[PDB]
Amino acid sequence: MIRLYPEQLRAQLNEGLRAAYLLLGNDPLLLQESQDAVRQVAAAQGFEEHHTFSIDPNTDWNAIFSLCQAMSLFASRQTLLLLLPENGPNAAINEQLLTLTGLLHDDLLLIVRGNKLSKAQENAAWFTALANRSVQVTCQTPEQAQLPRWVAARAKQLNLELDDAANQVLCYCYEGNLLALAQALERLSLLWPDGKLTLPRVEQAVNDAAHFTPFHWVDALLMGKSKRALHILQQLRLEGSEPVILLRTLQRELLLLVNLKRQSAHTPLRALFDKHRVWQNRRGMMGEALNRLSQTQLRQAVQLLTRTELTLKQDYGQSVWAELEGLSLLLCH
Amino acid sequence: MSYQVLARKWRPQTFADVVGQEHVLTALANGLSLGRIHHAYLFSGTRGVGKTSIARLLAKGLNCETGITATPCGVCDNCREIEQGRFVDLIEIDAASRTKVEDTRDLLDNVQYAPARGRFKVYLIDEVHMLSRHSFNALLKTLEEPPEHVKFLLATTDPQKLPVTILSRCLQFHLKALDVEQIRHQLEHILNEEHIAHEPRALQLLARAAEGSLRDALSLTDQAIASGDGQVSTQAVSAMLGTLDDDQALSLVEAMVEANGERVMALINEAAARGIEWEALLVEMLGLLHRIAMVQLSPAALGNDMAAIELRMRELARTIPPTDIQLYYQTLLIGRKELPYAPDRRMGVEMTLLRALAFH
Amino acid sequence: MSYQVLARKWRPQTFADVVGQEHVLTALANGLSLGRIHHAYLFSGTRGVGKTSIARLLAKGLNCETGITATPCGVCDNCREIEQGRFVDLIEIDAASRTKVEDTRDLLDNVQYAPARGRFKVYLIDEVHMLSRHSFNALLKTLEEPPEHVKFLLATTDPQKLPVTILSRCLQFHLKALDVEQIRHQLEHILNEEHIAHEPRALQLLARAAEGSLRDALSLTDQAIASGDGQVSTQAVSAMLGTLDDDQALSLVEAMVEANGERVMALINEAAARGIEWEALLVEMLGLLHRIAMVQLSPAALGNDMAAIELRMRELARTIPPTDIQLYYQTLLIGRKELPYAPDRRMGVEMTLLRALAFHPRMPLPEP
Amino acid sequence: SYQVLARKWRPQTFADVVGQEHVLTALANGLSLGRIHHAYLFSGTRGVGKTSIARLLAKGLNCETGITATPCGVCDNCREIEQGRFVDLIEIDAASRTKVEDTRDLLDNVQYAPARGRFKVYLIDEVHMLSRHSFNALLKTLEEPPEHVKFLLATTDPQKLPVTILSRCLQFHLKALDVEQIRHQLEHILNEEHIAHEPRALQLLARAAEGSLRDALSLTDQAIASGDGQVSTQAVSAMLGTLDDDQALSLVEAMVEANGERVMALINEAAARGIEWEALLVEMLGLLHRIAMVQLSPAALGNDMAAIELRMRELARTIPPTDIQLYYQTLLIGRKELPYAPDRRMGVEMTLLRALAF
Amino acid sequence: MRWYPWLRPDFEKLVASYQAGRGHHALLIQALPGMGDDALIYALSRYLLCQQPQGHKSCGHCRGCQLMQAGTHPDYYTLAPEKGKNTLGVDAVREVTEKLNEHARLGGAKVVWVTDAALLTDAAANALLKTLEEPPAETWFFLATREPERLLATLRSRCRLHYLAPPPEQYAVTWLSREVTMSQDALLAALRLSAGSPGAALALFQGDNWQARETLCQALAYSVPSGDWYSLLAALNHEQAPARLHWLATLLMDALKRHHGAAQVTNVDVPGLVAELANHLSPSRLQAILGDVCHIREQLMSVTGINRELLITDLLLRIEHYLQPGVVLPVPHL
Numbered sequence A: 001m002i003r004l005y006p007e008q009l010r011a012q013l014n015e016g017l018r019a020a021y022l023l024l025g026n027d028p029l030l031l032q033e034s035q036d037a038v039r040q041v042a043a044a045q046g047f048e049e050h051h052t053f054s055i056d057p058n059t060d061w062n063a064i065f066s067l068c069q070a071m072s073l074f075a076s077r078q079t080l081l082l083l084l085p086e087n088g089p090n091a092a093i094n095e096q097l098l099t100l101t102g103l104l105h106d107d108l109l110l111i112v113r114g115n116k117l118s119k120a121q122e123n124a125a126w127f128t129a130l131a132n133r134s135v136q137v138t139c140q141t142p143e144q145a146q147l148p149r150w151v152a153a154r155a156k157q158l159n160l161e162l163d164d165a166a167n168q169v170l171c172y173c174y175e176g177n178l179l180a181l182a183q184a185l186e187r188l189s190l191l192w193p194d195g196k197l198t199l200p201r202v203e204q205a206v207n208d209a210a211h212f213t214p215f216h217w218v219d220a221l222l223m224g225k226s227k228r229a230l231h232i233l234q235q236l237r238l239e240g241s242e243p244v245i246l247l248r249t250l251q252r253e254l255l256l257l258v259n260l261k262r263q264s265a266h267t268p269l270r271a272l273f274d275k276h277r278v279w280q281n282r283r284g285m286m287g288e289a290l291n292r293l294s295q296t297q298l299r300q301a302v303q304l305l306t307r308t309e310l311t312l313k314q315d316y317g318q319s320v321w322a323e324l325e326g327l328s329l330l331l332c333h
Numbered sequence B: 001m002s003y004q005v006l007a008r009k010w011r012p013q014t015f016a017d018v019v020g021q022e023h024v025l026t027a028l029a030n031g032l033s034l035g036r037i038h039h040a041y042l043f044s045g046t047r048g049v050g051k052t053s054i055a056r057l058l059a060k061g062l063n064c065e066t067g068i069t070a071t072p073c074g075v076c077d078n079c080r081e082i083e084q085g086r087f088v089d090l091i092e093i094d095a096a097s098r099t100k101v102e103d104t105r106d107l108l109d110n111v112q113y114a115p116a117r118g119r120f121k122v123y124l125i126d127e128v129h130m131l132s133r134h135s136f137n138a139l140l141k142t143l144e145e146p147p148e149h150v151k152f153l154l155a156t157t158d159p160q161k162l163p164v165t166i167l168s169r170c171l172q173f174h175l176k177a178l179d180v181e182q183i184r185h186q187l188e189h190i191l192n193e194e195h196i197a198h199e200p201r202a203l204q205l206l207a208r209a210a211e212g213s214l215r216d217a218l219s220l221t222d223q224a225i226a227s228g229d230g231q232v233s234t235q236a237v238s239a240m241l242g243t244l245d246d247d248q249a250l251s252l253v254e255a256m257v258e259a260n261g262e263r264v265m266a267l268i269n270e271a272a273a274r275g276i277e278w279e280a281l282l283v284e285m286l287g288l289l290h291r292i293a294m295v296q297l298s299p300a301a302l303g304n305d306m307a308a309i310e311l312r313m314r315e316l317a318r319t320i321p322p323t324d325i326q327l328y329y330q331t332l333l334i335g336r337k338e339l340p341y342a343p344d345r346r347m348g349v350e351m352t353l354l355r356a357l358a359f360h
Numbered sequence C: 001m002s003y004q005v006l007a008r009k010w011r012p013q014t015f016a017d018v019v020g021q022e023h024v025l026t027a028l029a030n031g032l033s034l035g036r037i038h039h040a041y042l043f044s045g046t047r048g049v050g051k052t053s054i055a056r057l058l059a060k061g062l063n064c065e066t067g068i069t070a071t072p073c074g075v076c077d078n079c080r081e082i083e084q085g086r087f088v089d090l091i092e093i094d095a096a097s098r099t100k101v102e103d104t105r106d107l108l109d110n111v112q113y114a115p116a117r118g119r120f121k122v123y124l125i126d127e128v129h130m131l132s133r134h135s136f137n138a139l140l141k142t143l144e145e146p147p148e149h150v151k152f153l154l155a156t157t158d159p160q161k162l163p164v165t166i167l168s169r170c171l172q173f174h175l176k177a178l179d180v181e182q183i184r185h186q187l188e189h190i191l192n193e194e195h196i197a198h199e200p201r202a203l204q205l206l207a208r209a210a211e212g213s214l215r216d217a218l219s220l221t222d223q224a225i226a227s228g229d230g231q232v233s234t235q236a237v238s239a240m241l242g243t244l245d246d247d248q249a250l251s252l253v254e255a256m257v258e259a260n261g262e263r264v265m266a267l268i269n270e271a272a273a274r275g276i277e278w279e280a281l282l283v284e285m286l287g288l289l290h291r292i293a294m295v296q297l298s299p300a301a302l303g304n305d306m307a308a309i310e311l312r313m314r315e316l317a318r319t320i321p322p323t324d325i326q327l328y329y330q331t332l333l334i335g336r337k338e339l340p341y342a343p344d345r346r347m348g349v350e351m352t353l354l355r356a357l358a359f360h361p362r363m364p365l366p367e368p
Numbered sequence D: 001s002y003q004v005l006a007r008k009w010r011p012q013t014f015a016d017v018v019g020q021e022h023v024l025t026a027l028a029n030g031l032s033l034g035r036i037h038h039a040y041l042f043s044g045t046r047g048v049g050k051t052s053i054a055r056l057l058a059k060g061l062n063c064e065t066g067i068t069a070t071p072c073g074v075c076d077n078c079r080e081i082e083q084g085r086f087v088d089l090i091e092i093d094a095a096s097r098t099k100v101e102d103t104r105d106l107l108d109n110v111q112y113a114p115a116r117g118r119f120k121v122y123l124i125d126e127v128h129m130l131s132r133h134s135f136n137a138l139l140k141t142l143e144e145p146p147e148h149v150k151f152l153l154a155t156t157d158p159q160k161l162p163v164t165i166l167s168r169c170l171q172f173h174l175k176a177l178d179v180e181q182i183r184h185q186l187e188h189i190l191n192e193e194h195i196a197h198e199p200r201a202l203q204l205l206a207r208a209a210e211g212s213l214r215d216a217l218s219l220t221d222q223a224i225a226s227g228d229g230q231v232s233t234q235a236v237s238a239m240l241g242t243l244d245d246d247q248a249l250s251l252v253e254a255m256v257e258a259n260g261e262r263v264m265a266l267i268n269e270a271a272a273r274g275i276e277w278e279a280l281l282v283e284m285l286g287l288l289h290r291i292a293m294v295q296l297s298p299a300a301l302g303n304d305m306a307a308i309e310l311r312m313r314e315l316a317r318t319i320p321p322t323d324i325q326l327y328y329q330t331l332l333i334g335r336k337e338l339p340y341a342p343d344r345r346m347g348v349e350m351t352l353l354r355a356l357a358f
Numbered sequence E: 001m002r003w004y005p006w007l008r009p010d011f012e013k014l015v016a017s018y019q020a021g022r023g024h025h026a027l028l029i030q031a032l033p034g035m036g037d038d039a040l041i042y043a044l045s046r047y048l049l050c051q052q053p054q055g056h057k058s059c060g061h062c063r064g065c066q067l068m069q070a071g072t073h074p075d076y077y078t079l080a081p082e083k084g085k086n087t088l089g090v091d092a093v094r095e096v097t098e099k100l101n102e103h104a105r106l107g108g109a110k111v112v113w114v115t116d117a118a119l120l121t122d123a124a125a126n127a128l129l130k131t132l133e134e135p136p137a138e139t140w141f142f143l144a145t146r147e148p149e150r151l152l153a154t155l156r157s158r159c160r161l162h163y164l165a166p167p168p169e170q171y172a173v174t175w176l177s178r179e180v181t182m183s184q185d186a187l188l189a190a191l192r193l194s195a196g197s198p199g200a201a202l203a204l205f206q207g208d209n210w211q212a213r214e215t216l217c218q219a220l221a222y223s224v225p226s227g228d229w230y231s232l233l234a235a236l237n238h239e240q241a242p243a244r245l246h247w248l249a250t251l252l253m254d255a256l257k258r259h260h261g262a263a264q265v266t267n268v269d270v271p272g273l274v275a276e277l278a279n280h281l282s283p284s285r286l287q288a289i290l291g292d293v294c295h296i297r298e299q300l301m302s303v304t305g306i307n308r309e310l311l312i313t314d315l316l317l318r319i320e321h322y323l324q325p326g327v328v329l330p331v332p333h334l
């Protein structure tokens, strides 16, 4: 179809609204902004009212299907917004979506919002049914590498001058929380109409609202950033994440890394990575970890992880975060 | 002879009487004066920081005959009816009381009906993070398109449990825990207006013991006045804070490191008078030593949990070689191992501290 | 006749009766005198220190018909039905039955009602730490501001389990465990008031036996009175507690230090016939050894008691270096821990003592 | 209506209780003097008399011949309490009933006047197994119960009880019964039941039961069940799987000289005979202790084992006391670890082989 | 379940006491897995619930016998954990306790069988205490366990402890040879690994677990001469960590016996492997490795929900560290 990014949808929308729009991504802010832009353009082009339906195992598909053929007594045009579940569609929902796609017409600016679909969901009848003229917008969260560029670009968009230090601080405090990041940018613009947000001007108006997953901590350990790892642990603990899943992902990737380090003296790193099915984006990070980490450090990490799991699984679970921080520090030397 | 509680008698009535949170007050004033008020305001701070006070003041600004503004008036009808807690359409809800999706739905059936008085129908939900996920989703669904005169005010101590999607619907404010200076100045003003004799050192002790919360400072001030017959001297506050002291493990570590046997004995006897379990004391001593070792490894090992005693912890990390930390940790580990079979554990913990002091 | 239990009969009924807790007593009396009565109280202390009794006394003081007096003043109707356990203003609530918010809400919607023939509706939420977080935040609003006629008295043992938010809106009062001298003084008061003969040594042993609470001291005193025939003696108290004569254990530790075997054997096989449990013999020896270790630490750690053998405590402290004391204590502790798996308890104690003898730092057993 | 030794010989009066005089004296004097508590916790190990003493107290408290320290045993209340059919004696198992509704049931039951007896008595067994909810909700009813309600508690370990529960009750610690008391009780029971017995068998049974009379009676019943209903030394030895001092002494002398062949062969032969590994280690520790005794004082030697004292004195002479102490500690640790080993024989082999490498 | 030949004399030593009317209401049978304690419990229950016994044996087609064979006897009780769990809860024994209060439906005995007393939760044990101590008239109990010491003290205090002595080694070897056909050394290995339990030897042989033992032996044949014990991971981490760790610890024990020369060892099927273990490893290192293996097996058996793979990997890494010269080796203490 037409696959675009949030910075391209604004230009695309002035070329004429399409039959359907699919907003795919894990970032709530990008999805919200793209949906708002689509709705504003639709209102400009004559779409007055809008209908919202969250897809649930108890979705009133008859109501929405009637809505496809529901005309407008006092209104003229109409949109139709669908909120996909966190796991995406299945057989029944995809069949319903195929029927809805068959029900599109001049009206029905069908809008689809949710998280990115998998390759299996990619190869589906409904997806191919609107595969000629629909517009798909990718709305994934920028990662650690591209976050400073993204926040600088948005600050330029919002007529705000930002420094490198302020960009780093905003990326640090609101990583994975770009909703709070945009709210912070708006707050800083409101508090200071000058727009020159120096480092002290942003240090006094931000709070540690960043959200992380266990994989973020695993990658921080592999890169060796002790401070980032400890920050991720603090954020995960304040969020209330169960330490067991952290220990599980740590165990899985640490066992894989121990196998790699053991086999390094036998087979080159490329073939070892290939055999163990290592993703390309993390091969350099894991090779750096293998180079930095010694066999003694790996044995000590395994020992500490085993002690931590034994402490947890014996129904005590007391001060497991201290042991996790100890392991994090140990793996970053 | 009223002698009412100083906590609520001194709740702020105008925005100029709120200590700290200056950026939040400026943002609220700017939204009330020139801009259009956002359809939902969420507040997140610490215990006794000002959240509900700020929300109530904002609701007072919303409903008033002078109009929607920052500093509306004094002693008006709506402002007084809010200050007395008797306002009709200023709904006050505890989220924990109505976590059920059915009760939440019943609460959200009231938004359609027009306000009885004023302009805006204001809902004030406390500890909003405790709402169930279904109730939270219903709240978001009613927040996306609220009525033109219906507004929501939400407060929570820990916003980390709130899903990120709440940021998509409401404008959030974070209130910074007050420092020693602001709390001390506000307590000084309160005591000066109430004609309470006091000393600056007593105020400093109260502020430091408050740990950032002004409600804690006011409660401690009330206790100090009650015990001291209004004469709030340094010695009175110091003694009554020592009665409430629970930093025994940290002081034990500090004194045992300094090879101060008499100090350790006095502190352990005080802990015995406190009726503290000895196994818990020893395990938290082990935790303190482990934290010292970790912050020695890297300055970032510390967090905000120990942000009350972080100064002494930094000094301990700076001054104590890691070998001494390892020796002390081993000594306390074997002491905890041998504690159950020892005599009455009040003396087993003592003798474990003895063994620790032997490494001098 | 009936002789209602000492705890029930001799429960304090006035601030001139409560022993210890000078801080909370002064706070309550002075606040009531000044009329600055907070709406939320948190009595926190170990078991049996007086939280419930002091709370009842405060409730008496608040609702005296004569007026608002510091102590419960001239006991009128309200006070005497309070002391009888009958309701005038005392809603005594166990928190274990109202942990759920579905019951805390029921409690809260009843608070807005005038009290009957009382000036306040005094809520005594005991073991308040047992509530649920939902219930805490539910009654949070009522704690911050209750009706004028509603007072909250919360009593609990561990204030650390409480959320900091509810901890903010409460006057915190911590009740220290009572010293042994105060406990003995109270027990002597009770026995003089009950026309029962008592011995100073027995009272001292009972006061030491109680771990800083007067409830345990009173239960132990009742048990000692039952052991006797309306009197308490050193023999009866020692038999009840199981503690042996300090001369025996002290002679045994002396013989272990002096590294003579025959004296140790004589002492142990004399102690066998006295019907003293061997594990308590080991416990007493370890307690003594740590006592000499503490004497080594400081002359402050001797004990007001143990005067009959204090000179010998000091002599053993002077003679023996701390390393030998540590060695003996470790050997005896390991022996006591190993005792359950020994062939016999006497066998285990004898082997532990002989092991301390064989590994004696200065005079080990002769070897071939 | 056959009953096994334990229940068939349950104490029925204060004069029928073995030992526990330190609590029986206080109990009888409290009954006589009129000083009666509302809450009694009888705590001790298994088979020492907590339930029996509690039932005797219940009988004495509400006898219609008055509150007496010597219940008649023929009255209506005494017989009904003995048979367990008395309504005012409610026997509760804390583990079975540890719920909020059961606590509310107790709380609203204690408010009604007793149906038959003077007092409504609650006998709760294994009280430490209640939930913290139940403990905290039952604080007041144990602190200030009604005038007609008295509570009896019985736990195997008071340490697991809340300390505030212990504070508001009368602590009766039941000492584990002495070997002589246990043996005399077996002798009296067997004489009253016309069962032939031998003093050596009684001594072995008393030593085997770790200071518990119920265990002694169960082992006794096993002895009657094996060997045509006679308590003989051979039958008791076969049941307990015990061995005389000869085998254990040979094992110890083999181990002390680091004779791996002899130690392993002796363990193999011991396994072939199907002996008790726990008993073997017990004899190991006993013989090592007697070796240390002979080392300490020449006259501190047993007289029964005069046949084996010849090698005994030589071994005690030729081995330093420290090595004997090390062997004793190693064997004790092995005995402690024995239940957790993959096999009992494997664990004792581990212990002995570890002792060899000294 | 199944009956065993050597198992008869113990049954005759118990059913006679029960016919005399002097049998204990609570009989605790101590027997290793595969010993056949379930056979005793079931046969005794059938005899007890039988109306008219025939020579201390179940009498063919009795009404009680018929309802026993059908498995729906109203007076019969079975206490086993639900197949989705490994513990016996409070309610499972509570329903037994409350429904035992009524009279026997057929007017005979009331027999209860607890399948494995070790699986009993301490709360279930405490609940069953009262019914074990003072059961109603004509009520009998049966409990089984691998080791009575693991049981609650007050639980076993109320029961007569019977012991099922394993059959003589030669007789067990003959039985195994009759059932399975292979070399005598394999039979000896299975018996001595099963602590003399021939039923456990049959269980080992019939399943694929013996082939896994062979795999572990090969992995050790490569593992000990090169210090590559980590490669044993795949040989140990298949839902059977206690069994594989037991075999490894027994191999170490046999090597230790080979040091202090002994006539008999367990792993007689692989003498060369035992010789390699003894020659290539220091005796103190063998002590440390055996102790650590036993401790890890105990931790795997005790803790529920633990990760087998992480524990085995840590065990192997610790063994590798112990192999290096100059390492401080652990010794059991305290």
Ligand SMILES: Nc1ncnc2c1ncn2[C@@H]1O[C@H](COP(=O)(O)OP(=O)(O)O)[C@@H](O)[C@H]1O
Pocket: B006, B007, B008, B010, B011, B012, B017, B018, B019, B020, B021, B045, B046, B047, B048, B049, B050, B051, B052, B053, B054, B214, B215, B218, C165
């Ligand atoms: N910024 C502030 N200015 C004035 N009083 C305050 C402030 N913050 C807290 N307080 C005092 O604490 C009491 C409770 O405050 P509250 O705002 O409810 O704290 P919370 O953030 O925990 O809900 C108020 O009545 C007021 O006396």
Ligand SMILES: Nc1ncnc2c1ncn2[C@@H]1O[C@H](COP(=O)(O)OP(=O)(O)O)[C@@H](O)[C@H]1O
Pocket: C006, C007, C008, C010, C011, C012, C017, C018, C019, C020, C021, C046, C047, C048, C049, C050, C051, C052, C053, C054, C186, C214, C215, C218
């Ligand atoms: N300060 C005290 N003065 C006198 N008696 C006390 C004191 N504290 C406890 N006691 C004794 O303990 C009994 C129960 O005390 P209580 O006040 O219930 O302690 P708690 O704080 O644990 O509820 C009283 O009857 C009294 O005999």
Ligand SMILES: Nc1ncnc2c1ncn2[C@@H]1O[C@H](COP(=O)(O)OP(=O)(O)O)[C@@H](O)[C@H]1O
Pocket: D005, D006, D007, D008, D009, D010, D011, D016, D017, D018, D019, D020, D044, D045, D046, D047, D048, D049, D050, D051, D052, D053, D213, D214, D217
């Ligand atoms: N002191 C004792 N005197 C006589 N028999 C006793 C004694 N203690 C225990 N027993 C025997 O043990 C059996 C169980 O005793 P019980 O009192 O239930 O012990 P427990 O304290 O563990 O509940 C009794 O039936 C009795 O045979």
Ligand code: BEF
Pocket: B046, B047, B048, B049, B156, B157, C164, C165, C166, C168
């Ligand atoms: F009301 Be606050 F959050 F303590």
Ligand code: BEF
Pocket: C046, C047, C048, C049, C051, C052, C157, C215, D164, D167
């Ligand atoms: F109220 Be107390 F802990 F006995």
Ligand code: BEF
Pocket: D044, D045, D046, D047, D048, D050, D051, D154, D155, D156, E154, E157
């Ligand atoms: F078996 Be008893 F009740 F400890």
Ligand SMILES: [Mg+2]
Pocket: B051, B052, B126, B155
């Ligand atoms: Mg609040």
Ligand SMILES: [Mg+2]
Pocket: D050, D051, D052, D125, D154
């Ligand atoms: Mg009992």
Ligand SMILES: [Zn+2]
Pocket: B060, B063, B064, B065, B066, B072, B073, B074, B075, B076, B077, B078, B079
């Ligand atoms: Zn106004």
Ligand SMILES: [Zn+2]
Pocket: C063, C064, C065, C066, C072, C073, C074, C075, C076, C077, C078, C079
């Ligand atoms: Zn009065």
Ligand SMILES: [Zn+2]
Pocket: D063, D064, D065, D071, D072, D073, D074, D075, D076, D077, D078
């Ligand atoms: Zn009678």
Ligand SMILES: [Zn+2]
Pocket: E050, E051, E052, E053, E058, E059, E060, E061, E062, E063, E064, E065
């Ligand atoms: Zn039949």
